[PDB]
Design a protein around this ligand. Structure first.
Ligand SMILES: Nc1ncnc2c1ncn2[C@@H]1O[C@H](COP(=O)(O)OP(=O)(O)OP(=O)(O)O)[C@@H](O)[C@H]1O
Ligand SMILES: Nc1ncnc2c1ncn2[C@@H]1O[C@H](COP(=O)(O)OP(=O)(O)OP(=O)(O)O)[C@@H](O)[C@H]1O
Ligand SMILES: Nc1ncnc2c1ncn2[C@@H]1O[C@H](COP(=O)(O)OP(=O)(O)OP(=O)(O)O)[C@@H](O)[C@H]1O
Ligand SMILES: Nc1ncnc2c1ncn2[C@@H]1O[C@H](COP(=O)(O)OP(=O)(O)OP(=O)(O)O)[C@@H](O)[C@H]1O
Ligand SMILES: Nc1ncnc2c1ncn2[C@@H]1O[C@H](COP(=O)(O)OP(=O)(O)OP(=O)(O)O)[C@@H](O)[C@H]1O
Ligand SMILES: Nc1ncnc2c1ncn2[C@@H]1O[C@H](COP(=O)(O)OP(=O)(O)OP(=O)(O)O)[C@@H](O)[C@H]1O
Ligand SMILES: O=P(O)(O)OC[C@H]1O[C@](O)(COP(=O)(O)O)[C@@H](O)[C@@H]1O
Ligand SMILES: O=P(O)(O)OC[C@H]1O[C@](O)(COP(=O)(O)O)[C@@H](O)[C@@H]1O
Ligand SMILES: [Mg+2]
Ligand SMILES: [Mg+2]
Lengths: 761, 761
């Protein structure tokens, strides 16, 4: 099973997508964990060509304390030698000199194209190399096959076969930090903010940025503006002013073009707006800022997961299997052949070269086209000449979660677009019982994207107590559908209302649960809306804490995280920050395990690494509290390290939503409203809505691959109501990755890696 | 004493410098605290002109929960009507209709120029108004004098009479957050970062940004580059590359020009760099981002302080006293006449228009010229043809503090410039005993500015125990001076060496203490190096915590800050966050005070405000711990509010230094080295150095107005060694501002306001 006797090479090439260091760390540590030798190739294909000093064998400490660093400690370089066979043969020679039959390439589309051409010629290159006399025929029959596992490290997301790439999320963090500097201020005078992103080839960053910020206008190369857009844009900004909206946002990609090949410059759009509107227009150009900063939490977890799965795929790969790219489509890990992804990239580039240009956007991926349609729909209120007698109420139930407001905004716009009479109830089930129902318009949710918490009030009170009041208010207001955006209390309350359909006719209405909670404890989803924000705030506090020892004092920090009994937040935060241990309820531990971990920490702390970090979920143990672990570690570490404690309380809670959470809540809010409208038409009968089947009350998912609708009655089997969490949680396999990255010898036979899948046309 | 029967108008005009909301809040609450009526004039001089709906009377809650908001809730507008007498008469009319004889103007240079011309014509405008028949002669003899207290709210810092303006620090926060995105990554390949700041008229932001980031080159309009700078810059970048420095930073102001009037564009410098060097050059233009984001901690405190002092100056102002600008020169509040400051601004503008252009930079202020010289000195190693037999060792003692590295970097460069042999010892006095002395060069401190903590080790151990080893190592290495960068332990250790001079001849060496600690507990200074960083981290945590309720539940948060017995950090943090109470050791409080505060909180919590925040210093009370206050507030608040607790541990410690701390530590490190060189030349006699007088061992200050050098022996009188803090601390008067902003009726007769001072030529 173990990959002993074989060597793995890891290199980074292209633009240094932040989170590359997390991928390199996971690749290295998994490679020497399974017994293989790991060789770090510095400067990418450059050091591959020159070789020699640029190829060094890695130990465990070579990738120590890099997960929080952006860029790449390996370094990346553009080399033209790898383009030509003269340098590529030298690269093959230097790999053979170290017995590196396994190569992991972390880079963009050009990097992976070079890796594909390098595999395709590996046999021919070895033949020409032995022919020229630099390697004997023996020692060339071995190493006859080169194994390539690709990782898409780039901010462009231009690699067509893959949905999400390393560094896209963090580039979005940089972009939205800049936009939030503008929008969160008390907007005082009429001004126009024109943001220029570096999406020269791919406009994905421009698109998701526009969606996350609610941009008034978007210039992306995939969909250039129609002729006469000059007037159409200026009029849009004009009515925006007439509304009283004091700030317009124009997101212009670097590759912005018109229907011809002529590019549209940010300076042109600036001067255009200034001339016709007179708004204070200034162009913000991020430039290198997009590649800068720390990697986001998402980038660290996903880079670590994909680096591990890259190594595992690199060991189970026989001479026959092709070069693969380890990526995630949705939440599911998958391997795609490198050749097909390169071919699709070439097809989209040719299409974008005025061949099938209007039909190139679909080949970019369904996510791009769907994102652009959602953006345009939510941007400007088109007239819904369609009307329906249906009306729906949007609830916010439970704790506040970052991204509830984004979901409510999208739900409101999409429902108004379908002609539904959208209501918002303040304080959730409390207000629904109290009749705090308020008919909502398009502009009443204006600017709700970036606001954290909940603009509607949240209450945890379940509907069972005031059920007579809830059904009375549903009857009075004629509510035909009920959109409940919230945590476990939201799911449980919808479950109670569904179970009470047996008693109350008025509760035979379509219900939908959007899981939105910090704990990620809602059954029927992988990511509760706002768990990403909490993880990001948690790691940032942990990174601050770990940085406070200042490279000299040997100190361990016991950091207590929230999440109730659900350990998701603690474990992922531990992966993101390189925590030594993340104690959680789902992995019960006794004093024997504590002594094992403490002795492990002491041994680690005698080496070069001086800042330890253990996370504790707030409800992981009845007796081994944070104070208990503090006393244990400080006593046993006496004469080696000091111990400190930090209970991250509501620091993990009140933040603005991360860009992932905004886009996520935006999209599933749209999808929830689409599903609501479809179910309401499917269920309207004899002059009224009568929704009584269990499939008419679902939790909107994202369960493995795509968005799902799990009926609450079906989820009740797999729900631990006492602990308010699901019985089977997808993320328990990530404990093994945490423990492996912390030098815990754990037999991870229970970890399942994504299998090969062909590209979806 | 109280200002009853009189009305104050507050308006904001010009670019919405963040921290305006803090100043407006303090102006309003001080105005209605002292009994005066406060009127909020919306859109600035615009609403002054039109009046009517744009002038609304303020209550205490009208400016509630705005201190953390950037921009201005009042709103600012550019109006040309106030330029002309037609609109200025209407403005005088609208002020007379409300009996507003008192006007506070928060704005830039143009705002304060308009306020000056409005005062100068106030009598003539009233005469013409009564002549035209819109006000009777009676009701015009009253209001015959208009009182103006100006506040400089702008990112430009173009107002010459003032040293620091509201929003400068926060604009610098935005700039440096963008630069830290670039510098904190693993620099993978050679790239050039060209940052464009909006300093169209003033290049102060460009300059301080360059100093804080260690920019390789700076284009500022105050000192345009000499002819042929094209080659000189490209060579500088060339040797920067040859060093192995992989990142070059070019800060170009928007108003960048050459010796002639031709502007230098960021695009021009880009294409120039690309052409001659081939580095990956991208231009970052911040644009509106500089005005964005939250105001920094410094901006919130200083805005509140100057807003309060503006109101007080507006009430103690008779018909004869002139229009004033409330500003701080150094740490001291001061009032400067509006006419002289406007006149100086006009003189500098005429000078910059090719009149006295080479001598316009000095009229900008001594701080600008000094900052530019320090920047150029530290930027590029010029050849020090001078040499001296003197040699000095730089220590880091105590806890790590953000900005120690900036101080050590400047000290090393400045010492090398004067020909001194600079040593750095790791682990402070422990290393000095252990002989961990390493001679250091120019490039050994490269990139130390933005790194928090301490590159050199820090230890708290005082030198008395191992004094024999210290004197032995001083003799071996020939250490003629000692620069100790650290907290109270640094000062105490230097005091011990000074007192031990009588026993050991070798300890008769010039010593200097740079106060560097989180607590700001070092006697001899007002701001310890890195206290600002801790305050900023603490408020960011407190702001996040206060946002965690998200307007639904009403909750009080007990946040515990660090600082030992020194309460500075708690109190300033409470001011910045609008904390209801900041419990500190220096203001002893009993259970009676706690009941008063809790009842006050309960009464407030029944009003519109829903999020309470009371800070507690970690060592304020022996028995009334954080758990005690949690129990008290949660019990007494039963049925009104819930209580929660968050002990900010090392979250206030490990952060990277704020731009203030970098510039501060940079400058005082230079000044400490200048003072060291002067003292060592004054003490060198008989062929050897013999420093026996008390003046040879001083703590570098910044004590009231400018930098001072207090001998440690003289400061021993005003030192509480048991509690490790000074006995008389300047900041105890800020408690009264905190309490007043929190609705506590406290007789602040002990607060001293800056008196009138003429401009310093
Ligand atoms: N068709 C190719 N054949 C061989 N090598 C290639 C090919 N394309 C790119 N490379 C190599 O990969 C390196 C980097 O590729 P590229 O310039 O496209 O950046 P990237 O991976 O796409 O990252 P990013 O999109 O963010 O800029 C190139 O310097 C080149 O050496
Ligand atoms: N927020 C926006 N950003 C960028 N382009 C936009 C936006 N809204 C509309 N457009 C562009 O303006 C063009 C016409 O707009 P409009 O929606 O009014 O007519 P349409 O027939 O419905 O176009 P379509 O349905 O294909 O998007 C579209 O091609 C679209 O690309
Ligand atoms: N983080 C925030 N907190 C509080 N208020 C905010 C925040 N961001 C924006 N706003 C407010 O929302 C208001 C509505 O205008 P906004 O620019 O935000 O959205 P919009 O462009 O007008 O419409 P849409 O949301 O569909 O894009 C703004 O005036 C602003 O005061
Ligand atoms: N010399 C002046 N006389 C009369 N009014 C003036 C004068 N200068 C400025 N004002 C008034 O103050 C307003 C603001 O001026 P301006 O647009 O030039 O920015 P600013 O005053 O310099 O502030 P900021 O530093 O933020 O940029 C103007 O609209 C004008 O009404
Ligand atoms: N880091 C820098 N950024 C921008 N301009 C610089 C920098 N260093 C030097 N210069 C400019 O280059 C010119 C000459 O530089 P240099 O310091 O080497 O000679 P100098 O005679 O000593 O000038 P200076 O009066 O500043 O000491 C000066 O006009 C100076 O303004
Ligand atoms: N916040 C930081 N943390 C850790 N390392 C850093 C940080 N900033 C810079 N560095 C590292 O310090 C190294 C020194 O090079 P750097 O370009 O940053 O400074 P420099 O311009 O060459 O010197 P100078 O301060 O005089 O301007 C960089 O290669 C970088 O890796
Ligand atoms: O119950 P949820 O849905 O998991 O809400 C998450 C929040 O609730 C908590 O239990 C704590 O909430 P409270 O501070 O209000 O008591 C934490 O898990 C987290 O801060
Ligand atoms: O000793 P100083 O100079 O006051 O340093 C301040 C820091 O030291 C502290 O006492 C905490 O130190 P420790 O973490 O080692 O216990 C806090 O007051 C603060 O974080
Ligand atoms: Mg690419
Ligand atoms: Mg101005």
């Amino acid at each position: 099973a173990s990959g002993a006797g074989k060597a793995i090479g890891v290199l980074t090439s292209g633009g240094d997508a932040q989170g590359m260091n997390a991928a390199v760390r996971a690749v290295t540590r998994m490679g020497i964990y399974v017994g293989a030798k790991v060789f770090l190739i510095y400067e990418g294909y450059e050091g591959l060509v020159e070789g020699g000093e640029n190829i060094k064998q890695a130990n465990w400490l070579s990738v120590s304390n890099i997960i929080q660093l952006g860029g790449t400690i390996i370094g990346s370089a553009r080399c033209k030698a790898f383009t030509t066979r003269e340098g590529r043969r030298a690269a093959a020679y230097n790999l053979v000199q170290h017995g590196i039959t396994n190569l992991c390439v972390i880079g963009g589309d050009g990097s992976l194209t070079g890796a594909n051409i390098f595999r395709s010629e590996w046999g021919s290159l070895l033949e020409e190399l032995v022919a020229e006399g630099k390697i004997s025929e023996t020692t060339a029959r071995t190493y006859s096959h080169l194994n390539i596992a690709g990782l898409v490290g780039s901010i462009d997301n231009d690699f067509c076969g893959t949905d999400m790439t390393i560094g896209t999320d963090s580039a979005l963090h940089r972009i939205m930090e800049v936009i939030d500097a503008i929008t969160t201020t008390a907007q005082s005078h009429q001004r126009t903010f024109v943001l220029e992103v570096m999406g020269r080839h791919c406009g994905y960053l421009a698109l998701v940025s526009a969606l996350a910020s609610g941009a008034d206008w978007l210039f992306i190369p995939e969909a250039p503006p129609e002729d006469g857009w000059e007037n159409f844009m200026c009029e849009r900004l004009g009515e925006t002013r007439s509304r009283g909206s004091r700030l317009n946002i124009i997101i212009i990609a670097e590759g912005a073009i018109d229907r011809n090949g002529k590019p549209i410059s940010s300076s042109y759009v600036k001067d255009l707006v200034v001339q016709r509107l007179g708004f204070d227009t200034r162009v913000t150009v991020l430039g290198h800022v997009q590649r800068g900063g720390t990697p986001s939490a998402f980038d660290r977890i996903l880079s670590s997961k994909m680096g591990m799965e890259a190594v595992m795929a690199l060991l189970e790969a026989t001479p026959d299997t092709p070069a693969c790219v380890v990526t995630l489509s949705g939440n599911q890990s998958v391997r795609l052949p490198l050749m097909e992804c390169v071919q699709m990239t070439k097809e989209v580039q040719k299409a974008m070269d005025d061949k099938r240009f209007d039909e190139a956007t679909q080949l970019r991926g369904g996510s791009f086209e769907n994102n652009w349609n959602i953006y345009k729909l939510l941007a400007h209120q088109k007239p819904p000449k369609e009307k329906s007698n249906f009306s729906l109420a949007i609830l916010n139930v439970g704790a506040p979660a970052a991204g509830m407001n984004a979901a409510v905004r999208s739900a409101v716009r999409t429902g108004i677009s379908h002609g539904h009479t959208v209501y918002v109830v303040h304080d959730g089930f409390e207000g629904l019982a109290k009749g705090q129902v308020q008919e909502v318009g398009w502009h009443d949710v204006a600017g709700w994207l970036g606001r954290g918490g909940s603009m509607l009030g949240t209450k945890r009170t379940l509907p069972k107590g005031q059920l007579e009041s809830i059904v009375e208010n549903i009857r009075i207001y004629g509510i035909h559908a009920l959109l409940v955006v919230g945590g476990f209390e939201a799911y449980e309350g919808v479950l109670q209302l569904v179970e009470a359909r047996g008693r109350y006719e008025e509760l035979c209405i379509v219900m939908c649960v959007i899981p939105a909670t910090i704990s990620n404890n809602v059954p029927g989803t992988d990511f509760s809306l706002g768990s990403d924000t909490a993880v990001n705030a948690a790691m940032e506090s942990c990174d601050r804490i770990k940085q406070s020892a200042s490279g000299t004092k040997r100190r361990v920090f016991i950091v207590e995280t929230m999440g109730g009994y659900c350990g998701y937040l603690a474990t992922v935060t531990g992966i993101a920050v390189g925590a030594d241990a993340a104690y959680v309820f789902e992995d019960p531990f006794n004093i024997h395990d504590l002594k094992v971990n403490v002795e492990h920490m002491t041994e680690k702390m005698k080496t070069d690494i001086q800042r330890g970090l253990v996370l504790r979920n707030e409800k992981c143990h009845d007796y081994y509290t944070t104070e208990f672990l503090y006393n244990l570690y400080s006593s046993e570490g006496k004469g080696v390290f000091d111990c400190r404690t930090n209970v991250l309380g509501h620091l993990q809670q009140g933040g603005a939503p991360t860009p992932f959470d905004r886009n996520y809540g935006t999209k599933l809010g749209v999808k929830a409203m689409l599903w609501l409208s479809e179910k309401l038409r499917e269920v309207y009968r004899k002059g009224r809505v009568f929704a009584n089947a269990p499939d008419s009350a679902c939790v909107i998912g994202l369960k493995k691959k795509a968005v799902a609708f799990s009926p609450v009655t079906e989820l009740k089997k797999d729900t631990d109501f006492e602990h308010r969490m699901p019985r089977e949680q997808w993320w328990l396999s990530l404990r093994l990755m945490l423990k492996m990255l912390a030098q815990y010898r754990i037999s991870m036979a229970a970890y399942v890696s994504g299998e090969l899948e062909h590209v979806t046309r």
